[PDB]
Amino acid sequence: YDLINVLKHLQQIFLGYQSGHNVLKFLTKNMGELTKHYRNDNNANYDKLLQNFELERQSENPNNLMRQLLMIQFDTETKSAIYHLKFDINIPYPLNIIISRTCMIKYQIILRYQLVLQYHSRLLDETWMDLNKTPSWKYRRIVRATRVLHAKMNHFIKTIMEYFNQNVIDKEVYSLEKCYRNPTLAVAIQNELEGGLTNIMTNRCLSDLIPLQLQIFDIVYKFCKFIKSMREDAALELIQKLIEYISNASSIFRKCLINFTQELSTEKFDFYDSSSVD
Amino acid sequence: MGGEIITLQAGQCGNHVGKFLWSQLAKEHAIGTDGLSQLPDSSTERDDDTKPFFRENCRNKFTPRAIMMDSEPSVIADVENTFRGFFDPRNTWVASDGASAGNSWANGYDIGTRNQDDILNKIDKEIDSTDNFEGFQLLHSVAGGTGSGLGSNLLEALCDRYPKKILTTYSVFPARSSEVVVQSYNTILALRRLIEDSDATVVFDNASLLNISGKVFRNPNIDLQHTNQLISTIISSVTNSIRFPSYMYSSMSSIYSTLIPSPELHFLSPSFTPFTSDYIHDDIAHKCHSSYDVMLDLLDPSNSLVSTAMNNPTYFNVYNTIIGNVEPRQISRAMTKLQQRIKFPSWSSSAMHVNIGRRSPYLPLQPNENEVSGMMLSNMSTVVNVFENACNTFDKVFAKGAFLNNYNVGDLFQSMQNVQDEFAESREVVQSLMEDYVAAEQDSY
Amino acid sequence: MGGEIITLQAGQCGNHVGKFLWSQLAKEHAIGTDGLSQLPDSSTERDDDTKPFFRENCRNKFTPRAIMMDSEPSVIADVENTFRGFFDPRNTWVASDGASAGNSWANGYDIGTRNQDDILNKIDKEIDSTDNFEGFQLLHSVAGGTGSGLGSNLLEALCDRYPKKILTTYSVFPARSSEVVVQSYNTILALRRLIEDSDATVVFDNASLLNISGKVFRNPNIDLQHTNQLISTIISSVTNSIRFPSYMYSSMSSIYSTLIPSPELHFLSPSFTPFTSDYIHDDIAHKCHSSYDVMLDLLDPSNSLVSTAMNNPTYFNVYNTIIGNVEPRQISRAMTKLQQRIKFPSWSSSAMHVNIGRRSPYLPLQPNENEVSGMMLSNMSTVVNVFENACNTFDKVFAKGAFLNNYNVGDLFQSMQNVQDEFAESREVVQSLMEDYVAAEQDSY
Amino acid sequence: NSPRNSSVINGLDARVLDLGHGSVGWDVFTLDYILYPPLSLVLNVNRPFGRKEYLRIFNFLWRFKKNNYFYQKEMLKSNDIIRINKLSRISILRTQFQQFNSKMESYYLNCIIEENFKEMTRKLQRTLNIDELESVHNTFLTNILSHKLFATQPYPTSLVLLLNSVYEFVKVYCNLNSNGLLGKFNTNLKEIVSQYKNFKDRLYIFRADLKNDGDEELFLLSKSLR
Questions:
Q1: Which three-class secondary structure state does DSSP give residue B251?
Q2: Which residue in A67, B215, C209, D81 has the fewest CB atoms around it within 10 Å?
Q3: Crossing angle of helices D179-212/C329-342, nearest 10°?
Q4: Strand partners, C376
Q5: In chain A, what are the domains?
Q6: What family is this protein classified in (chain A)?
């Protein structure tokens, strides 16, 4: 029935640890549509990208398991797409007995966070690569502020991605593999499934980073959107407005360094609150 | 399909390492001497190295996505072998002139202008043939006629023509001490193109490379071709994670973004481990993470001769360390957390200490022993000691007013000899900015 | 059935290219070197063996429907060969009343007039076996004595005698430069008749054709015989839709009717990719459907220079893409949508699309392969430049006053060559007119 | 044992069956295929449904071919010179009109029909019941029903009007060869050009529709008619 092979396939899609190229190219198409919340047309386009990808890989078989059985879902509105996305699985047989409701939900969640990190990184890179080129610079100090803040943010996201992949994914997978080989028994698969649901479940409880992070990403999206415009009295006024925006972002980032040593930045929580009511 | 890459090979050195490089990948990905697959490789699944680096005739005959430029010698070596049929012969261009490059920049450059059209056609054809072109890798020599002169033109052309795609260079700097008096002039002229026309440059210093090749590998009579074997090994391994699926953090763009945050720094130095496992008759044994980080700082054991003082206590702008093999990460993470705190380089309090780490495994298309290995990619201020030395020699040839002549006879240098002076002045500015970067003073605070 | 075609072969070249054509049709349709059928089932109406290029005897020895005019040499070579019996000695007319063309058009045109009836008898016999005549193909070279004069004479007569049928000529042009000046005389007198009396003319520009022969075939012993093998592969591919009507979206007559914008523009240029061996090593070059698709768009292998391969700033009147070999259709449509959208050809102010493609498979009587090939046949307004050149050469020659004596006997040319002066004004009006069609004035209300 | 022993030699008889009589034979025409034992007790019933469907498709194809032959015939006759600057002006207009319809016909055959039949045959080869025939046919017929309903409601409307306009020109053209003929010919020429320009604008919306595979704008145009 060749269970072993399918297990590897599962580790590939559900765990998502070998689908990188596809997530990147999935994000690039329909970037604007995802930034916003659900609109009807959003959906048509999103579904097209799905139908195209189902044509593009898996030809290792008469019938693509990955492509066919797994599709990605969007929730209807008429906040942002990113929340509204979920990942959906259509069930096989007799393999279906193994899989359980809880398990698919666990996987869909690692995929969503992963995906979240992934879109932000792509956007951080494209903006910087542009900025290194001649047209954005030189028709003084303000330039230097944009350069430093950008370098620092890239660092922060890469350190995050290292910890998220090592400390979570690499660790759990390492363990999963042992459990299947060492004991080759049916009992060993049941044990392992339980292990696969945990550590993601612990990690969920330990890390609850994303809403804060997300606030900072929106400020980042705005910043970068402005930076893309390139080349008097107006510029300077606008610069001033950006400058207060930068200091606040700089002060939270300064607080955030402390968190890596020992968790929680009061300052970012405190900025949202202040905005709620001072 | 993939983010496809065109490799451009220029000069004797560039053609020698470039040919070897394809030979290593062919061994690694179990294919022939013309990329012919063996029977278990016509089975389902192999690594996705294939479409970025390679193209298919789609009969399972893989071909390198490489462009060869030189004159007759290097091309003749490829033709004698079964590596001529491996490589697409249209991507290979061979020219001469009645007044050839001759290991002088000006001749290589005048010829470059004549065949401006020809090179751009060749390039556009390969670009048109490409799906999802990510960018270019230039492989070359500054001890080349071709690699220097022809190379300087192509760098200029690539700058103007397309600004959208990423340009990376692997530039080999001479082995050891001065070979000809006019060397500083040849070197600065190529170096001009390299600062302005490229987004990123990986410097491979032959002197450093040679020390390893003579001593470690043991060559009683050493040569450039022998050293190039090491370089093709360094370049290939650095691409291992790109070619190895499960990685997409290995990615050229995310690496670039993290490493390079202004066009003023972009000179990379690599450091490497192992250099052992050749001609087995001595012990080969697995290192560990600490041992790996400690070897890299040493000057002639690392690939680059930057002329550092006391083995890099110098200002690091950024560090990325890439570890190869399976080994407990945790052990390392704690040790690394202490290594930044001791702080081997220098830093200012005007920027954070940014340290990145990448872990990459090995291909299962070839057998492994899982030995502790690594490459490091860092941007360091210490390279400038080399540039100062070049500048001094350059100032001195200028001052004498003698041996300016051979360049000056060509029309470009005859109309204006202003151009060299402008570059020297600029070059002093590049060094000045790198020095400012060591301090706090570098930004607006 | 399918509408019959008569080939007229004039001059050395036509007869040579014609012999080669026949071997190629004879192989493809699984018939002998005497047209004798292949005895086991090799043809059960899987294909329809082309009654347009053949006639059937009732021994069922297929014979080509062709008229050869030249002198003795080319016809002799066939007759020596076992290719005779796929010949007809009655169709064959050898000059013994030619007495030296001399490289003079007039001389040729005039010998043709003298032996009009015996010649007309070969043609009428061939016409009389016909079911319903599609039209004629004239194979010849221009700048010849024979190739020029006798073909032009025949064409004007055919024009008047049968005014309801198609006249196509496959014409070899010299170059867009001259080393021989009286080329221009031969070419201008012939050109009038070719412009009016042919409804289509396929230009093969001999400079361009030579490049293919020299570059691709790479034999130093090369001549016209060798080159003619490249013309015959090209000519045979254009005929695929007639010889195989079993392609139910490629049928020649209707295709011909559509593509033609009006006979005002009708100088066509071919291009082809890749190449089949005929005097060099086998085609082992396989590449992707995408690769195949890219290659058709490049005119970088120039088999004709009618000034569509120099530059494209005016507009393409029509483009037809000939695909040979079946290959995934779905893919062929997705690439095709990208090509119409991308708009590779240049365009006028009312024509922005008019590019077509036809797809046909290979016959299995040939050794099976999964390599794809294709031909481009296109009509472009750039052709006017060749006329412009022709006018420059024409003024030059007329300025020397070279050989006016032969012309003066003739009534037409009493006050020296009047016909050439008449033509000079006529050609300028047409060239201006083709330019107006690139611009807005083409539709004006 | 190829045609003599074929469906075409044996099987076809020409049929006349039509609702009413026109002023033309053409409308009235149909084609009859003789008894086949798969269907000697499957459609030999109170409903000859299977034979009606196939017929429907057959007609749509047949009208397109009938117009196609007329368009080649019309054009060919004109190359003769019947049936100054005016001559060139008409010659380009005629060719362009033929070119767009023809291009359209290329896309219908290639993109829908050839691709659907190909897929069907391979799927039969790669692998036995009556049903498998019916299924593959059904699938063919379904793709065509979907295409029919959205595109081909304007598209045949447009194609039939183009056919009339070419006959009107061709008819005018024979007459020319005094003054009265020239005055009429100039009027008719202007008229063909306004009708062409409006068609060209639709054509552009239509090109966009082939590229998206179905754009919005065409959707709107068809909805407005309806």
A1: coil
A2: D81
A3: 120
A4: C271, C321
A5: 3-278 (1.20.120.1900)
A6: Belongs to the TUBGCP family.
